[PDB]
DNA sequence: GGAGCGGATCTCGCA
DNA sequence: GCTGCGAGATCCGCTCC
DNA sequence: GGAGCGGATCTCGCA
DNA sequence: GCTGCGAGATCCGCTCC
């Protein structure tokens, strides 16, 4: 369930092979009719998918084209993290499997409307991406657009000046206080609590103000 | 209200959206959207079978 | 700076970007990006401070056109005559408020003269004269003149003269025409000058060639000293060098380098 | 509210374009179009989500090119031949991938037909067919064609499939290329779409 | 902030107009042929083309007091005030700039041969060789001020994000329901911190079990 | 109850009755009849 | 409603009226054979009455 | 733990030590092939350590 | 610790680990250059121990 | 007291 | 050195007119 | 604060 | 003129010593 995380899978529908990509966070889907399951076709489709929008990670299962020599080289060339699920565990890629149902059920309705199968695929993409408007009233494409817009790093790089403070904290095991463990840089200061990154465990922890003290500022 | 009802009906005919989508888009009542979606012959034909279960004697 | 040079090089090898794009993306100095782009064999086989000059007339009056390749900045001013002296006056008055580095122009009676080349030699800005046979240049030059001349009649009736509309055209083009996040072309130029000024602070102390040795770290094993290798650019404890064997740029800390006297 | 009178006064004084007024005052797009139409000088003589469609020949290869006027976003595909069915499929896929609102093209056999016109009315997008009058679309599409063919010539030997080279050129010209304040021709489109969404949500 | 001034000088039976800036120190020179108001108007609009002012102050002039002139300056939207300045700082700056430019131009006489070339070359030398503070040209400090004001005006964009997020927890070895929606407090690499409503306690949750949603109406 | 809405509207135009009678004789929901009679300028202005 | 033959479900048939509504299953009237049938809740599709 | 071949699960093997405990699956050490394997939670049987 | 250049002090450079406490000056380790430096006592601000 | 309405709850089938 | 999922129906308990 | 403990919750596979 | 089911694991929240 990552932000730029995509799951890809094949499916069959009445002597037709469809390749489906599903975005984990927003729920946006992208389906394409493919003649076969060869490595070259998958490479072309996946680099077109990268061209349309920039992902960061991919999840897939074992397959003749998902795992090979050329495809791994292509993914390294593009710079996409690739993860392979446990064999004989189709439940691993649950999201794409559920989108298979949600795609077939809707595509059953639009077949009579259009003579061309690709037209039906585009229509079901319309009705499942833009015209869904589910939940609070935002289509998945809107969520994807917002997430892509807020991902800009230049906004984060606009300001380079910020106050820096350090803190003293101790662990809390079974209600028993421990000992102060070095000075730590404050990550974010709210009300009634604070966040500290423990280097020994390399993990983020939350400490109440009763177990937090502040060093005097430089003077 | 009444004026945009044909617009919502034709939009659902063209795209076969959901009742919640129609209510959030055209501002029609949820009951009206439910009536529109339930009256679609295509939607009724391809709808999933009902899921009600009982218990033994 | 030093660290991300190989990343920019490999990205350009993958996609064949341009120097301006590399500078804006990876933050490398413009000189480094230009060097990387120029050394590309495929590219060998459009930039800031690069302008083009064309001649045009309207209502029997002399006007000069200055089109910037990147920032899309247009400048104009009334010219009394097409003679060499008046042409030089306008050309160096153009440098009075601007600091370019390259310029291109066609062949003209006032372009070539015994005193024209020596005058620009003192300025030091490189200028190239040639025939613009590129279809891209032909189609790009055409649209600029139409764009600047269309705005002329939109404000003639309440301005007294044509030289009054001269400033109105610049107001219409360089001030109000905005793209991106509401960015004017003059805003683009001013922002470009900001990152253009940065490299002076580094090149001020780098104007003296040095030879130094470099040592390659492999799994924590220093190995040996290798060199000599020319120092490309300086950094805060990082130095980039060229590898003779692998033909790749390497980054080394300041603790694995010595000074070789000249 | 006062932004509308301010934009009206500024257009009276200078006669700028609608996109600049929308970007610099945040006025509604409909109001900007109304102001533009109400100018007799402009009428008698660069829109968001405005697209241009063209064909390209590449040493027997047919390429369909879609160019966004406001943002330099290019969508290129390979077409077997100039046919109404293929054009309808391609345009429906294009509407599937983006959220356009208007389209401009020339007078062509597949472009002008009862079937395609009915389909585009079905989608709900304004269509304008004829000789362009604004001296900006022709130059922009010429630059797009020139850059696209140059990049295709550059990147063809690296990959095997022609569609692979086309995808690589789209990557180079849509994401990797940058300009202005370090912005890409694809991030600008996302920003414009987000602004349109938030304005529509705020209004209705 | 963005204050401008005008002053004329007479040399060799010729008139030179000088544009002066107070906060930064921009200096511009031009040769005024006649005293007609048309030359002043075209010079002012050329200056408006090459510069973006906000406030301008100047003394009285024979052509300045004219209904057409005020109408044009209001068409441009710039502001202007009448009356002789009483600020000693402005007078001192104007006098120093004028004496410096006169000294530089009289020192540079033998190098040139023409006149307009001479004026523009003097403009180049005055606008380039003037190193103030950390070796900053007046145009350099002007562009510094412009970029500083632009970045301080555009810095509000990065602050108005307030994005919303969902979250879930692991209970008895199985994932829980998607609790939310809610507003994220601080989001760093690996995990984000959020406020919980069930127990009114802060909870840190990794990125592998969250969803990102724009804020509702 | 959507198919008879235009017919009910034209009947209202012919007769100009009140919302309760329309709801009780046509099966239309009460809210729809209230909005219909609200849209009626003649019925709205004489209240 | 649909009828299962040898486990494989058949094509959907109807629409028909629910003669008797039961929690586990329902009873429907067939036109082809003029005989009563009992159909479980997993092979039914409730729809509003047509007009 | 057990290994699935062509979908059909194999005979149970072990007992072995849980080298790395994960929520979705675990990593175990094999004696026959001296190789590491990842086994999903649906093919494991937790037992107390023998003595 | 703050650095001095011809009588002009620098900034505190953030907290750093101490090495040894001498008389009149102390020795510290720089993180940017991994170089050991010496700083006078008057230019060093002591961090009080936890209370 | 009529009224609609937001949300918890149910099964089943993608592989 | 990792992983189940949600769309499409149905009522309760609610509050508001 | 340590301690065990009753009970809600989970999946999967009979046909 | 009728129907899904529970055994076997695992923690939380509890209170009592
Ligand atoms: Ca599958
Ligand atoms: Ca049995
Ligand atoms: Zn429908
Ligand atoms: Zn190159
Ligand atoms: Zn106009
Ligand atoms: Zn009425």
């Amino acid at each position: 369930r990552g932000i730029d995380h995509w799951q890809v899978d094949y499916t069959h529908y009445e002597d037709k092979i469809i390749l489906v990509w599903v975005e984990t966070n927003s729920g946006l889907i992208y389906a394409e009719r493919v003649k076969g399951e060869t490595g070259q076709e998958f490479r072309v489709q996946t680099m077109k998918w990268y061209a349309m929008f920039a992902p960061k990670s991919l999840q897939s299962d074992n397959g003749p084209a998902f795992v090979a020599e050329s495809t791994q080289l292509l993914m390294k060339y593009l710079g996409i993290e690739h993860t392979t699920g446990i064999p004989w565990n189709p439940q691993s890629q649950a999201l794409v499997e559920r989108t298979h149902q949600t795609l077939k059920n809707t595509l059953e309705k639009l077949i009579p409307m259009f003579n061309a199968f690709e037209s039906a695929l585009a229509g079901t993409l319309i009705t499942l991406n833009i015209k869904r408007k589910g939940g609070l009233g935002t289509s998945p494409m809107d969520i994807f657009i917002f997430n892509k817009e807020q991902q800009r790093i230049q906004q984060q790089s606009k300001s380079k000046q910020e106050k820096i403070r350090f803190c003293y904290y101790r662990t809390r095991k079974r209600g028993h206080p421990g000992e102060w463990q070095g000075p730590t840089q404050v990550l974010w200061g709210g009300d009634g609590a604070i966040v500290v990154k423990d280097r020994g465990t390399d993990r983020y922890l939350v400490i109440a103000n009763k177990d937090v003290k502040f060093i005097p500022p430089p003077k | 209200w009444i004026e945009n009802i044909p617009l919502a009906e034709e939009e659902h005919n063209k795209w076969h959206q959901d009742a919640v989508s129609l209510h959030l888009e055209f501002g029609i009542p949820r009951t009206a959207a439910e009536d529109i979606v339930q009256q679609c012959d295509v939607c009724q034909e391809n709808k999933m079978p009902s899921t009600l279960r009982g218990s033994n004697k | 700076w030093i660290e991300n040079i190989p990343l920019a090089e490999e990205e350009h090898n993958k996609w064949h970007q341009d120097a301006v794009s590399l500078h804006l993306e990876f933050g490398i100095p413009r000189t480094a990006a230009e060097d990387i782009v120029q050394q590309c064999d495929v590219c060998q086989e459009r930039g800031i401070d690069h302008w083009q000059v064309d001649y045009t007339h309207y209502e029997d009056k002399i006007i000069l056109v200055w089109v910037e390749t990147n920032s899309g900045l247009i400048y104009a001013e009334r010219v009394k005559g097409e003679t060499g002296q008046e042409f030089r006056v306008q050309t160096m008055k153009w440098y009075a408020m601007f600091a370019p580095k390259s310029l291109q122009s066609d062949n003209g009676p006032a372009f070539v003269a015994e005193s024209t080349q020596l005058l620009m030699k003192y300025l030091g800005i490189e200028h190239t004269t040639g025939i613009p046979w590129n279809p891209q240049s032909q189609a790009l030059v055409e649209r600029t003149h139409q764009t600047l001349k269309n705005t002329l009649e939109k404000l003639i009736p309440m301005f007294n003269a044509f030289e009054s509309a001269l400033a109105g055209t610049l107001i219409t083009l360089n001030i109000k025409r905005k793209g991106g996040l509401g960015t004017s072309p003059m805003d683009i130029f001013i922002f470009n000058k900001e990152q253009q000024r940065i490299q002076q602070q580094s090149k001020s102390k780098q104007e003296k060639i040095r030879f130094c040795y470099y040592r390659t770290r492999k799994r924590g094993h220093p190995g040996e000293w290798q060199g000599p290798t020319q120092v490309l650019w300086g950094g805060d404890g990082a130095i980039v060098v060229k590898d003779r064997g692998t033909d790749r740029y390497l980054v080394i800390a300041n603790k694995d380098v010595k000074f070789i006297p000249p």
Side-chain angles (χ1 to χ4, degrees), chain B residues 1-56:
Chain B
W1 193 272
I2 300 294
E3 190 174 3
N4 52 46
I5 279 295
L7 177 77
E9 182 181 0
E10 67 183 1
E11 285 322 283
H12 171 79
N13 288 318
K14 298 194 307 181
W15 293 119
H16 280 283
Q17 300 179 0
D18 206 338
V20 191
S21 60
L22 298 173
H23 165 65
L24 267 297
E25 178 147 331
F26 308 106
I28 69 171
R30 184 140 185 284
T31 302
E34 206 68 79
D35 194 4
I36 290 169
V37 67
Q38 285 178 355
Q39 282 302 328
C40 180
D41 48 353
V42 178
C43 304
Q44 289 179 340
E45 184 175 321
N46 304 286
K47 78 158 56 172
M48 61 79 71
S50 173
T51 69
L52 276 297
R53 304 293 172 263
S55 67
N56 295 108

Side-chain angles (χ1 to χ4, degrees), chain C residues 217-253:
Chain C
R217 182 77 60 165
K218 180 56 170 56
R219 308 271 97 87
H221 187 273
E224 78 276 338
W225 291 109
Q226 300 177 6
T229 51
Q230 160 73 8
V231 179
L232 306 179
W233 305 284
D236 199 2
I239 297 100
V240 65
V241 296
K242 294 184 178 179
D243 195 12
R244 187 182 295 276
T246 61
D247 288 345
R248 301 292 183 191
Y249 299 161
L250 272 298
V251 180
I252 183 59

Side-chain angles (χ1 to χ4, degrees), chain C residues 202-209:
Chain C
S202 305
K203 75 173 184 179
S204 182
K205 315 168 186 176
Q206 277 300 122
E207 47 184 332
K208 181 267 290 180
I209 176 166

